[PDB]
């Protein structure tokens, strides 16, 4: 399908971003959209044969380009706080069905002093659940991160699992009144009781945090909240 | 723009989901398109059509003879089908795509043997603790949260090995915090097993 | 020298017959004046017309979404637009203006030529006949082809070579779908 | 192909000289509208069309962009085969029977135009008349050549003689077609 890089991006006011899009092999038309919770799916421009065919109503600082292999790039100058959105790329043979990509989640901030990596903690299942249901539910809690550019996964014995896993779709705000509140995320993994009671079994909750890049300057005294993986583990106990 | 959809809709897991769409001003040269967007993802093309019926590996689309209404048919509604479904019209003339409000589809699991209970979990690295309200019926709503108390929403879990499905809700606080004093804001059934 | 030029044409042509009973779509891809590829709705697939076309037809037929979209253009372009022709173009009726004028100064027993000018009518279906004393002239009648004025009106000039005798009456008969009756215009030899 | 009504729902033109292009729709040989590719407007050719018919001019810009792309692919495949210049045929006539004093319109039909690049002007008593002059777009033909009709709203009088001046690559000298009462 359609590929877009980067998937997450943090920038401050006045900077510029360049977003890449790889259309489906054989497709020649590339459309760019900006998706916000307030304005919805807004059209930017559409490119065909290295030329802009259709144009939206966005200002001149939103520019695009398409290469000979139909791959496309998009540029935004003088980033404003209102530019925070999901920038989607749609691909089509020429005029037919448009297939979207994952999009670039761009967050524009006034500074970087509120960016924090998450703290991860695993909670072992209750002995009451084990004796009552013969099943063991682990709970993972990622807290204190900003922004919500986070991907949580479970790893049992070094292999990633999806069966019996449920993560919250959207991280919740810890201080719903503060405009600069940090987020919290919860996830569950349910296995059988006897599988959890095996000391050889290893359960790890892994949280991928997308933060600052090496290009971003950092003047504060705490550790630079770069893109990193924070995880917590728990062994089985009989 | 030209399409009207209900803002939200529920359906049973395993059964068929029939999402309706109204478009009376549709033109004879406009297609009926269907897209869905799972949270934190991009729109996924599903199916499109012009007149009568259409089927692919993902869904079925039925358009009335007068073409003033359509219905997207998900054959086997799975837990992954819980997303926002957009019904739109398009000329297929190389122009832009316009999305409406869409329908928020929620796939409710069928808990064969509900055994609601509120268990307490201890931190593997420690004093910190969370409460787990699980194994309740899909008709039960988790409500919300006290400012210092945090409560999540209903999360459907599927153990493909045991062919088992269960709802869940996690609540924690940094206090005073107690199990029964956490989910008291929701309509918890009296059969909820509060262990010792 | 004459400047070099490379021309490309694409023609989406719809052929309607018997109202809406028979409709046909023929899209044409023309390089300069060489039609090298076409889609005929009666065939159902793109076809190469000249050795310049096979690479194009093979590619468009190998794209499911393109081939389906073109087959649907029989309904999305031809049949849809024809419904709007019924409401506008196909109901347009402009009555013809019929005037007779001799080519030279009329003189008794002298060669002359009468021009029945049928100007500014629509649609194109027209029937004009010359008459002399209730007898249809069929030998000295020279009619020009249908003249297209380009402004959605037609014109035709029917010329009759004759010799005005004393008392002769020349009538130009015109039939047109915009007229409820056939109309005539008379011309008499001056006394 | 025999049919009661023939419609060109898409006569698309693009040529390297300029470059230049044209989009229009035709029904039974008459131009319904043309899209001004520069101003991005649909110009219907009858008041009846402007009231009940609508066409998005962006559709024309999208198609012409495909023709520009297709022309570059076929130029390479055809080993750069240039277009052949055709000799256009010019005919001048009036819309109505000319009577001295009654306002009439002079029509100049330039047929067999290829490539679709031509100049059509009017000369009244030698002087190039500019006011009251209009022309149609390039109208399509089955042999893929074009023809264009120019108009001149004039006042018949024995004082004035008129000529239709046509310049084309197929013509060595500009062709003059005279019309007199």
């Amino acid at each position: 399908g359609v590929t877009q890089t980067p998937r997450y991006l943090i920038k401050t006011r006045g900077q510029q971003v360049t977003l890449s899009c790889s259309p489906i092999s054989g497709h020649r038309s590339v459309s760019w959209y900006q998706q916000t919770p307030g304005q919805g799916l807004q059209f930017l421009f559409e490119y065909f044969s290295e030329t802009q065919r259709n144009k939206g109503n966005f200002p001149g600082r939103f520019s695009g380009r398409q290469f000979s292999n139909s791959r496309s790039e998009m540029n935004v100058s003088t980033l404003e706080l209102g530019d925070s959105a999901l920038y989607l790329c749609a691909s089509s043979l020429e005029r037919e069905t448009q297939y979207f990509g994952p999009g670039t989640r761009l967050l524009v901030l006034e500074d970087l002093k509120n960016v924090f990596p998450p703290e991860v903690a695993v909670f072992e299942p209750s002995e009451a659940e084990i004796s009552h249901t013969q099943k063991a539910t682990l709970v993972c809690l990622a807290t204190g991160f900003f922004p919500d550019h986070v991907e949580l996964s479970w790893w049992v014995n070094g292999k990633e699992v999806h069966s019996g896993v449920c993560t919250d779709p959207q991280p919740l705000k810890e201080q719903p009144a503060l405009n600069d509140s940090r987020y919290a995320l919860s996830s569950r993994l349910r296995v059988s009781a006897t599988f959890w009671q095996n000391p050889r079994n290893h359960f790890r909750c892994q949280v991928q945090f997308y933060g600052l890049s090496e290009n971003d300057e950092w003047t504060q005294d705490r550790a630079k909240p770069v893109t990193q993986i924070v995880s917590a583990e728990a062994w089985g106990r009989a | 723009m030209k399409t009207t959809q209900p803002p939200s809709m529920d359906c049973a897991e395993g059964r068929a989901a029939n999402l309706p769409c109204n478009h009376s001003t549709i033109s004879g040269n406009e297609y009926v398109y269907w897209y869905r967007q799972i949270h934190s993802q991009g729109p996924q093309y599903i199916i499109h059509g012009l007149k009568n019926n259409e089927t692919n590996e993902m869904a079925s689309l039925i358009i009335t003879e007068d073409r003033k209404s359509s219905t997207l048919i998900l054959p086997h509604a799975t837990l992954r089908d819980t997303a926002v479904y957009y019904c739109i019209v398009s000329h297929n003339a190389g122009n832009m795509l316009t999305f409406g409000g869409g329908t928020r589809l929620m796939v409710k699991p069928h808990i064969q043997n509900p055994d609601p209970a509120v268990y307490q979990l201890r931190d593997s690295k420690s004093d910190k603790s969370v409460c787990l309200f699980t194994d309740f019926d899909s008709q039960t709503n988790v409500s919300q949260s006290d400012s210092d108390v945090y409560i999540t929403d209903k999360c459907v879990l599927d153990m493909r090995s045991m062919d088992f499905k269960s709802n869940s809700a996690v609540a924690w606080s940094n206090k005073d915090f107690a199990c029964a004093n956490a989910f008291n804001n929701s309509i918890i059934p009296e059969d909820t097993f509060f262990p010792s | 020298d004459s400047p070099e030029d490379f021309v490309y044409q694409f023609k989406g042509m719809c052929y309607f017959t018997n109202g809406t009973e028979r409709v046909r779509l023929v899209t044409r891809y023309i390089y300069n004046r060489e039609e090298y590829a076409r889609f005929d709705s009666d065939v159902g697939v793109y076809r190469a017309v000249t050795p310049l076309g096979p690479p194009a037809a093979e590619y468009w037929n190998s794209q499911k979404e393109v081939l389906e979209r073109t087959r649907a253009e029989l309904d999305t372009v031809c049949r849809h637009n024809y419904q709007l022709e019924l409401r506008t173009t196909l109901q347009r009726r402009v009555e013809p203006t019929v005037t007779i004028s001799p080519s030279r100064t009329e003189a008794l027993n002298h060669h002359n030529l009468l021009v029945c000018s049928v100007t500014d009518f629509y649609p194109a279906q027209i029937k004009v006949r010359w008459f002399r004393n209730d007898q249809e002239e069929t030998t000295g009648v020279v009619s020009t082809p249908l003249i297209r004025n380009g402004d959605w009106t037609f014109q035709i000039l029917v010329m009759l070579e004759m010799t005005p005798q004393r008392g002769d009456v020349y009538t130009c008969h015109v039939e047109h779908p915009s007229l409820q009756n056939p109309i005539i215009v008379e011309w008499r030899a001056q006394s | 192909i025999v049919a009661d009504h023939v419609a060109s729902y898409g006569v698309n033109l693009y040529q390297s000289y300029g470059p230049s292009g044209q989009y229009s729709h035709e029904f039974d040989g008459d131009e319904e509208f043309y899209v001004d590719l520069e101003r991005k407007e649909t110009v219907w050719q009858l008041p009846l069309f402007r009231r009940f018919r609508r066409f998005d001019p962006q559709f024309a810009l999208t198609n012409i962009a495909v023709l520009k792309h297709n022309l570059n692919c076929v130029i390479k495949r055809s080993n750069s085969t240039a277009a052949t210049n055709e000799v256009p045929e010019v005919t001048v006539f009036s819309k109505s029977p000319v009577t001295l004093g009654q306002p009439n319109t002079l029509i100049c039909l330039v047929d067999n135009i290829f490539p679709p690049v031509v100049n059509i002007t009017w000369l009244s008593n030698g002087h190039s008349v500019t006011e009251g002059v209009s022309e149609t777009s390039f109208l399509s033909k089955s042999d893929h050549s074009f023809f264009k009709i120019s108009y001149l709203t004039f006042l018949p009088s024995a004082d004035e003689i008129y000529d239709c001046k046509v310049e084309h690559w197929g013509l060595d000298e500009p062709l003059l077609k005279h019309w007199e009462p």
């Binding site: - | - | 899209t27 793109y46 253009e73 | 609508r54 570059n72």
Partner: peptide, 15 residues
């Protein structure tokens, strides 16, 4: 009231 359409040209594959 409704916008009309014309034929859509296929694009040559000389990428």
């Amino acid at each position: 009231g409704q916008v009309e359409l014309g034929g859509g040209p296929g694009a040559e594959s000389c990428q």
